Write a protein that binds this ligand. Structure first.
Ligand SMILES: Nc1nc2c(c(=O)[nH]1)N[C@H]1C(S)=C(S)[C@@H](COP(=O)(O)OP(=O)(O)OC[C@H]3O[C@@H](n4cnc5c(=O)[nH]c(N)nc54)[C@H](O)[C@@H]3O)O[C@H]1N2
Ligand code: F3S
Ligand code: F3S
Ligand code: FES
Ligand code: FES
Ligand SMILES: [Mo+4]
Ligand SMILES: [O]
Ligand SMILES: [O]
Lengths: 843, 132, 843, 132
């Protein structure tokens, strides 16, 4: 087992500089503080010599504020000087109440440190492919090259020849400053159509369904998970993936701890401990933890067949509407009352690829969705009694006929699941029908991924459906590719084909570059353009590490992430915080928003020198010298309630921030919105919500049914608790990599026995899309025929076996994947030290 | 003093321990709960004739809840937020919220069966120095 | 400036485990000790509690044994446990007398530490190109893949389709165990012809000249530098490149400190403080240091024109012979008296490409070499008075009529200089003529590079001249490449062209691999072989880090280096020591000799399975389990005196070891040989040394005169004191990279002004062979028109601008390089912190 | 205590320093020779109104020979083995045999012009702890 052998830690002194810090990582947005103080000083164990006012000579008690793990401690540069830093979770933050997850609590140890040699992989200098390898250089040199190639291709081929891949998210590698910067470059200065997002290969929304219906996806507050009678948890593994929401808000509900709170806010009605329905094909540690906390009678795990959620929700909708277990006045008052006729191709297809579902009234939607318990039991593989029970836990009145309050929470099990638009809609139907939006203990919400931090100019030019970028790239289209803060090599769909083609096309430009003179820049630029014209691709990566896609790139631009800069974002409750800079960017690395600005300045200069003065002038408005300039040009001027928010005011509010949108500022407080839709006025022209007539139509995405019928196993995929995303930071973190050197593929012990495998064996997963590797992990809770592989992992990319299949709006259907499995090697020696024991807590 | 000065403390005798049954101990002082445990097989950090006696803190490095031991599984389990540690593999966190594998004792067996502890390989919950 | 902020170090306790450690790095082979003790124990300041028996609560005085720098401390794995280690120089080693160079003294800090995060770049696992990227895997898998491809190719195409590049040197990344394992694999089991060495592109000697003359190039002892009247240092920058030999042995001579000992061991002649002639077109810190210690009047810096050494030496030989400043008795008794005939194509060309010069008697060599002072002054650019003065400093009898004792030392300025064969012989002529071989204060020796540790089967099948491997590879020939412990991307000649072609050929195999299924290994192997038949190359790297050439390779195998294994080698005095293993190999890395043996075993198995059982049996004789087994099969059975040497016996000799060859073993001591040739019996069949009739014929290598004529500046090249080799370890050492993030190019300040360059500017160096980058370092001592660029550096490779030109024996003429210089960028911000002051100590 | 406890010692007053002439001091005790030096241009670790006052150990971190100062070049120079350190660039070893750039004092000027040292950024030659 990995052990740091760090016997003691420097003590935070009493005069240490305090900084407010939102977690770099997940949507929950747990509050932390970073405390820094000069190298060559320290606190003492006497109360007035440390920050805690506590005697550190004696053993602190459980949940102590006066302790931190070694992963919370580092040394970093700050204004050019080495300082001690501790990054420690805030007890006073209502999101987390001092919880720090396994990811967040390692922000310090995954920071860049020369003095203690952490994250020495971090990018420090611009790199350019020249003289036969990547070579460091100046910013002026590298941007120049990028601008000139980009400018020439775009002048000769139009802006369609510029392909962009970029984060649209919040937190580290995202945020309002950084989404504004990149957005402004590509959508204000330019009209880039062939742009895709970090997690999906087109410029779309994850949840067009709920938005079209008028219900924006983050409509509740985290307190609603404490107040609900029933939590409906769809396609979430929240203990692993939205950890501290689960622990600090859901658990008190299930345990009975929030009964006093329920009673005070909602007398006039009966309350019991929270019950929970979990819709997930896989029995997860979330399921186990729910059972251990609430008892098994209070947990309904619907272990559905992969991709059958829509059938289940349509049955639930049918049964609840027939019983009349609905909020009649919410429907009359707040939903669309005049139905409208089905489009001609229904139920198989919508009016067009742009509208996969039919929006209409409650009663039209019920008749459209109508599915009996017996049909949904066939499709979902659930028992009829399980479906009836869940309709009861969602819809049945409580004693005295009072409305059952239900928080409906969904994430990637649904969004990357089958028929995203219709499944999304059919779940929103359940919430609208039961009046569970805009009310305490309600919500139909994304549980979320990254934090949120989106402000950009109009994307109207993009279209709906937008262009499927990976397919343009695979098919030889496009000339120049700017990649910001994502790594398709590890995380796109159909990733094996993507890599083969991306290498080949970038190699053409590599070979031309190696053979041409660099010091003569015009000749290098022309040699690149000639290669692009023959089918090559010139590629530029803006990142904080050497990425996998980066190995194909021609120019790499070093970025500064959260904490090295100021950053704003909101959590899954709309809670906007400012993370206050506490350290310097490594070497010459620079905030993304300022990278975009310097790039815009360079485009202007270059286009001017080419004599295209008109095009050059589109790139003005980028005079920003610090990230706050981007905040003010973007968020402050464009978000609803943006006028009320500044860095100074945000900082004053601390880690609790406020909930967006801001409604005003009085008495040094930004006033916010606790829940959305409290007045029953939805996000449509007429203020009414729509229901969705959304009939089940099987596996919707191309090739999926053929992939299921022709391979042995389900290759379910997703997150591990210990791993953050594509392990970009984690690959230089021994604690994480000592645990999983290879990605795990969870397999039922009997399935393993049948296939001739033993724990730790390295196996090839393969199908029609490609092939990859993973380490067999015996998982007694796994159903026969169903495996789960860790996604995004550098030592075994799951995406290689995901097909190209998307829904009509180009949403990638990663969860419905099937494959074969065969052995590559006996368990390697580098895996002999691992535990292969169950991940479930035992009582 | 550049490193922590760990005392070498007698904890028990090889004869006091029964197979697969933890015995409560404390190290490096009375306020730091732990166990010795004889596991039945040669393991990482294990001492004695069979290389199977290990010692661990039993205070969760996440937030301090005392860990229970499941005998059927040979794991330590946290009632706080569901962490599991494997003392058959150096205390590796099998699944959990701590950023540390379970602090484990550097043990020595004396010629007379006595069991000393003279080290711990991670930071014990609730102290910024393992020796206070 | 880089600062560790390490305020204090753990004290080595009285009971630490002590290990004999020869420096990993240069020829000098400084002796060290590695002290390990358990993590969680430590020494104290009282004498009884530390290894020194000194009170460490008191400041120590100059040259204290009881101190070590932060770079000599780390924590490492040893038998699976974390231990403190200190690796510190040995006061008692006669080689260094406690000196640790800037490189030696950072052995500990450049070791792998999981606990302190040093050298996290080290390879831990075999890697194979599959599924779009490098992926980690098991030894059994990776070796099976290597052997199947290698075996299929060799069976279809012959052994000539296997190309090999390997170390032939000693110390880390070489040594007697490792050279034997690799040599047995490729020269016993196989007869590989197309093998090159780490520093030169064919299987040749660096010094065929001196060896053909019967004078093995390491024929003296280090004491001889203390004892000479005159040192002649040719093409060496010993203060930077043979640092501790220079400081512990040359300096005492120059300072007069060795007079006592001189007059002790050689009474019956006069002794004065040594004088030194330095033959080097550049004024180095070596020249400066010599002047500062001995006085400028005792240092003669012959600042010759690049590549004109031969004309100087032939003039000196002529003048000295004419004056009769020769050792007549040594010449009559110990050298060829035979008359001979110059070959038909003399003087332009030797008898064949195998023999570029003509071996003769003293008298025929004098007449063949004959060159006037005036003609050599014309060629070398030196004054007549300087050449006459050097001839006196070498040949003029001392006061009694007594023979002047002279140590001739040479290195890469000569060896990678012009007309290697003739120039080597012409220098040896001087030492032969003056009887300065086999005698105290004498010698004509390599000053060396790496330590030495060669033992291998006969190379007779390789031929002479041997195959020019880079040219085979660049021309599309060969099928499989095994690369061990060298990185041509940084260090071969004509490296720009090498890299363009190498990338292209390996890409072909990569593209085939990514499209074939790995789990059907026979299909994988066939795709690889087909790609090879189309012109591809399959390439396997054995190394300790991800290398530059490694980025083109398809399998990577992780090696363990000195200290992680036991290792034997000798220094430039033939002093053989055993480095005793003190730590574990990182992850699954294994010593090179055992990798070779496992590769041998896998070839036996794979060939057996193919049905080629007779060929398979040639791969027996590799049952080794530990590196000592390769020592015993190699050195012990094959070196002269081998039977006397074992690990146990070496260990008892400590860091002083013995000088090879061993003559015997008595009373616990391996007995050795202080100097070679003390009886006047040379390494030829008749025992007589030959002189060399070796006439000047200009710049010998193809294209060199044209390169010089058509480009503005000399691009001299070579080492820096702070940098070790291609910075394989140094690139994750912040002390080194903070000093020089780019390779420097030294430039005369007027040369800078006239080219519009400022200190730190990033410049392109370009010519017919290619282009590269460096950072301009203003250097007042540099001559107008003459620049010097650090060689081998990852962030700007000098080799790119060296042409393909070799001598007839395929010796790479790196030092004669001319090119143009132009600016790429203004000083980048990442060099703003650098000092650009003179490297020369000021009094 | 996890780190070294440096004393905040008064070395001299800003008024005692003449441009480019070192003033011999000692820090963090009397056996660890160093100098304060006013350089006439703002530099790394430099204090005082012009940002140009630096403090260094003048004991060679290689083998301990006392360093000489060249006023013409503004460098420290070692007569032991020819090392050169640049006090205008944080003590950077321009060329030399140490594995350390020159240990530099963390300095502070009080309102009366008094110069204190409160730390050192590298390990002083001849001691295994900068504070003995
Ligand atoms: N610090 C350090 N020391 C090392 C090494 C290292 O990487 N770093 N590597 C080691 C290795 S492998 C080697 S091979 C040796 C190399 O040791 P050296 O040969 O001493 O070092 P170089 O800098 O390669 O070249 C030495 C001198 O040759 C001069 N020179 C160039 N052209 C000519 C010429 O035409 N005639 C003459 N007479 N001189 C010329 C250069 O100006 C230079 O000063 O050093 C070893 N020692
Ligand atoms: S600590 Fe960070 S990773 Fe998610 S659960 Fe809290 S935000
Ligand atoms: S310390 Fe090492 S690098 Fe050479 S001078 Fe001595 S062997
Ligand atoms: S206290 Fe143990 S898992 Fe949180
Ligand atoms: S003592 Fe200063 S250079 Fe060696
Ligand atoms: Mo996501
Ligand atoms: O996400
Ligand atoms: O060499």
């Amino acid at each position: 087992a990995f052990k740091r052998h760090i016997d003691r830690l420097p003590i935070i002194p009493a005069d240490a500089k305090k900084h407010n810090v939102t977690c770099h990582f997940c949507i929950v947005g747990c509050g932390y503080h970073a405390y820094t103080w000069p190298i060559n000083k320290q606190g003492g164990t006497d109360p007035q010599n440390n920050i805690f006012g506590v005697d550190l000579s004696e053993q602190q008690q459980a949940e102590s504020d006066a302790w931190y793990s070694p992963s919370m401690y580092n040394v970093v540069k700050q204004d050019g000087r080495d300082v001690h830093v501790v990054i420690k979770p805030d007890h006073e933050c209502v999101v987390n109440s001092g919880l720090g997850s396994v990811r967040g609590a390692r922000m310090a140890e995954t920071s860049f440190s020369e003095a203690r040699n952490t994250q020495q992989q971090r990018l420090t200098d611009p790199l350019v492919w020249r003289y036969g390898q990547m070579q460091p250089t100046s910013w002026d040199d590298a941007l120049d090259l990028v601008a000139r190639v980009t400018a020439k291709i775009v002048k000769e081929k139009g802006e369609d020849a510029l392909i962009v891949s970029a984060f649209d998210h919040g937190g580290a590698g995202g945020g309002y400053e950084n989404t504004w910067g990149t957005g402004k470059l590509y959508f204000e200065a330019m009209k880039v159509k062939n742009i895709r997002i970090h997690n999906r290969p087109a410029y779309n929304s994850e949840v067009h369904g709920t938005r079209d219906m008028g219900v924006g996806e983050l409509n509740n507050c985290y307190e609603d998970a404490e107040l609900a009678d029933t939590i409906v948890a769809v396609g979430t593994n929240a203990l692993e993936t939205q950890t501290n929401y689960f622990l600090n808000h859901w658990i008190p509900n299930l345990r009975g701890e929030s009964l006093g709170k329920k009673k005070e806010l909602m007398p006039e009605e009966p309350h019991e401990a929270g019950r929970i329905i979990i819709v997930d094909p896989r029995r997860t540690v979330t399921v186990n933890a729910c059972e251990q906390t609430a008892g098994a009678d209070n947990v309904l795990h619907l272990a559905i067949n992969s991709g059958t959620d829509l059938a289940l929700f349509n049955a639930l909708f049918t049964y609840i509407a027939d019983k009349g277990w609905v909020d009649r006045d919410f429907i009359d008052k707040s939903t669309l009352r005049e139905g409208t006729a089905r489009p001609p191709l229904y139920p198989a297809r919508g009016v067009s690829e742009a509208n996969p579902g039919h929006l209409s009234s409650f009663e039209d939607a019920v008749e459209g969705c109508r599915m009996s318990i017996e049909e949904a039991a066939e499709i979902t593989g659930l028992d009829a009694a399980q479906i009836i029970k869940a309709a009861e836990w969602i819809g049945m009145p409580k004693e005295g006929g009072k409305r059952r309050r239900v928080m409906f929470g969904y994430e990637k099990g649904l969004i990357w699941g089958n028929d995203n638009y219709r499944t999304n809609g059919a779940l929103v139907n359940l919430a609208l029908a039961t009046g569970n939006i805009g009310r305490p203990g309600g919500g139909v919400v994304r549980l979320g991924g990254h934090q949120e931090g989106y402000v950009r100019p109009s994307d109207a030019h993009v279209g709906r459906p937008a262009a499927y970028v990976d397919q343009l790239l695979i098919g030889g289209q496009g000339g120049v590719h700017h990649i910001w803060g994502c790594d398709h090599y590890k995380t796109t769909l159909n990733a094996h084909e993507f890599k083969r083609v991306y290498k080949k096309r970038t190699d053409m430009v590599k070979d031309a570059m190696s053979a041409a003179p660099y010091g003569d820049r015009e000749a290098m630029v022309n040699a690149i353009v000639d290669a692009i014209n023959q089918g090559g691709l010139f590629a530029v990566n803006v990142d904080i590490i050497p990425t996998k896609i980066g190995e194909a790139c021609h120019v790499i631009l070093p970025a500064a992430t959260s904490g090295e800069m100021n950053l704003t974002s909101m959590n899954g409750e709309r809670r906007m915080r400012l993370t206050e800079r506490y350290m310097d960017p490594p070497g010459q690395s620079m905030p993304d928003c300022l990278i975009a600005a310097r790039l815009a300045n360079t485009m202007e200069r270059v286009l001017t020198e080419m004599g295209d003065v008109g095009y050059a002038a589109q790139f003005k408005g980028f005079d920003w010298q610090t990230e706050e300039d981007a905040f003010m040009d973007g968020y402050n001027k464009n978000a609803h309630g943006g006028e009320f928010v500044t860095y100074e005011r945000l900082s004053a509010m601390g880690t609790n921030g406020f909930q967006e949108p801001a409604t005003g500022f009085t008495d040094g407080k930004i006033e916010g919105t606790q829940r959305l839709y409290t007045d029953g006025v939805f996000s449509t022209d007429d203020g009414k919500a729509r229901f969705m007539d959304a009939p089940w139509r099987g596996l919707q995405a191309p090739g999926k049914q053929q992939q299921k019928d022709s391979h042995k196993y389900l290759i379910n995929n997703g997150r591990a608790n210990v791993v953050w995303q594509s392990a970009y930071l984690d690959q230089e973190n021994d604690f994480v990599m000592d645990r999983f050197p290879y990605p795990f593929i969870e397999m039922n012990p009997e399935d393993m026995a049948e296939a001739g495998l033993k724990e730790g064996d390295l196996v090839e997963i393969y199908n029609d899309a490609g092939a990859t590797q993973a380490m067999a992990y015996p998982t007694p809770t796994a159903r026969r025929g169903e495996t789960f592989m860790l996604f995004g992992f550098p030592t075994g990319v799951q995406g290689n076996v995901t097909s190209a299949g998307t829904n009509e709006l180009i949403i990638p259907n990663y969860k419905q994947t099937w494959g074969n499995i065969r052995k590559i090697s006996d368990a390697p020696r580098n895996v002999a030290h691992l535990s292969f024991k169950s991940k479930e807590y035992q009582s | 003093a550049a490193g922590v000065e760990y005392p070498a403390n007698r904890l028990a005798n090889i004869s006091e321990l029964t197979l697969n049954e933890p015995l409560d101990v404390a190290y490096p002082d009375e306020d730091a709960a732990g166990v010795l445990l004889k596991l039945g097989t040669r393991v990482e950090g294990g001492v004695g004739p069979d290389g199977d006696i290990v010692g661990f803190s039993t205070i969760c490095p996440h937030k301090g809840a005392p860990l229970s031991y499941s005998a059927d599984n040979k794991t330590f389990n946290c009632p706080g937020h569901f962490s599991v540690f494997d003392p058959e593999k150096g205390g590796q966190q099998v699944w959990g919220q701590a950023t540390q594998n379970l602090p484990q004792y550097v043990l020595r067996v004396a010629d007379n069966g006595d069991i000393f502890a003279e080290g711990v390989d991670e930071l014990i919950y609730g102290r910024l120095s393992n020796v206070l």
